[PDB]
Design a protein around this ligand. Structure first.
Ligand SMILES: [Cl-]
Ligand code: NA
Ligand code: NA
Ligand code: NA
Ligand code: NA
Lengths: 242, 247
């Protein structure tokens, strides 16, 4: 487990956007970020899907998170632009971006993976991720201390049979993070890094018993770390949660 | 250093090898080298006129008439890839080698300024098309006694660098694709999959990527062929999943 304990006000005055916030790891990140003082912006397919996590953040005592609905599989460049303008309109600032959303697609050998499935996984996991980062980079580059975290996987770092487009999309994600990190270095106050969450007790991981994995809630040290002031200067890193 | 392999003039006798982006540069050099080492070559490129020179060169060296296939990577669908495979199957009944050489660079701007559609088109051409072509040809490659797929990569597909736009990203995906497929092919087929970083060459694509570099600094693509020949011939049987360098 990554070793870091966050102060209850670690992220105060910071605005952080989380994609895939409805369930699983994204949901735990939205909650933990809100619990540590950050104003959180939640991305998901429908308001309905973000209602429970939002009710949780509100029950805990934080103001209604900003909810933005987007179909990552469909969303156009213009939609990401409109999303960024919403964050600008509300906050004038973005300090954090957690790229958590992605789909696995079929787990079949490449020879059997339909072309349309390969394309859709690449679009959701890579294209949408790029378009979202591009739209938000002006806002992040205004911040005094901003952080971008991409989610990867062991199969994004060493290719394994029957992971279809998922492993390939996670390689692409690492290459995107490394490219971005090299552009940000020194000349901006933005950092870019990847997080391998490892095995978690989520619907998504239950892929690959389940009792052997921690709750996503419990893999939050590295997530809190990258979004707060203690990771200033840490850039271009592929890190592990566990 | 230059990959250490010398290829005997009949090294590739008995082999049918498809080369993408065959019209010029590294693709043309590989097509010419494979034919010169005894292979039957299938030339893939955008237009007949673009492929005439390389086809003519191969015929004249006496090697003889290669198969020419036209395809538009930005908009070819499974129908086009299926028909390509059917043509290869009709003529040869198999494929012994597949050199994925075609790719595009896109803009080399910072990511912040990289237009969305340019990013997606680079990803489509360099990755989606490479996958669909691979998938259409795998059954043919599997009919070979000893088959080899080589993906083209780049130093920036292995360690990311500023202002490579979608190009570095696409080559990271390429290495991912190669590794995944190698793991699926290993021990249960006679097909290997590896990647090649060609390094710097004296081509129009290198000049596009480095607008201020003088091409005189770079070797001719025909001089970087040792790894290209190695991977396609029997001396590389059992080499699978590896990220190799031409230079
Ligand atoms: Cl050229
Ligand atoms: Na929810
Ligand atoms: Na199709
Ligand atoms: Na383009
Ligand atoms: Na196909």
């Amino acid at each position: 487990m990554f070793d870091y304990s966050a102060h209850p006000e670690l992220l105060k005055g910071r605005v952080i956007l989380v994609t895939g916030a409805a369930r699983g790891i994204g949901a735990a990140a939205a909650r933990a970020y809100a619990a540590h003082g950050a104003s959180v912006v939640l991305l998901g397919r429908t308001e309905a899907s973000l209602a429970e996590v939002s009710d949780q953040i509100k029950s805990a005592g934080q103001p209604q998170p900003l909810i933005i609905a987007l179909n990552l599989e469909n969303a156009t460049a213009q939609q990401y632009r409109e999303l960024a303008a919403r964050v600008e309109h509300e906050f004038g600032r973005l300090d954090g971006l957690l790229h958590n959303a992605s789909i696995i697609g079929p787990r079949t050998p490449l020879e059997q993976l339909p072309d349309e499935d390969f394309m859709q996984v690449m679009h959701v996991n890579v294209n949408a991720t790029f378009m979202l980062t591009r739209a938000l980079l002006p806002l992040l580059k205004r911040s005094e201390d901003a952080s971008i975290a991409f989610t990867s996987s062991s199969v994004g770092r060493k290719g394994r049979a029957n992971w279809g487009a998922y492993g390939v999309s996670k390689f692409a994600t690492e290459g995107l993070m490394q490219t971005l990190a090299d552009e940000l270095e020194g000349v901006t106050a933005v950092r870019a890094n990847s997080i391998n969450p490892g095995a978690t007790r989520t619907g998504m991981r239950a892929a690959y018993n389940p009792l052997n994995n921690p709750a996503p809630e419990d893999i939050m040290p590295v997530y809190l770390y990258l979004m707060g002031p203690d990771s200033t200067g840490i850039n271009g890193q592929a890190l592990n949660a566990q």
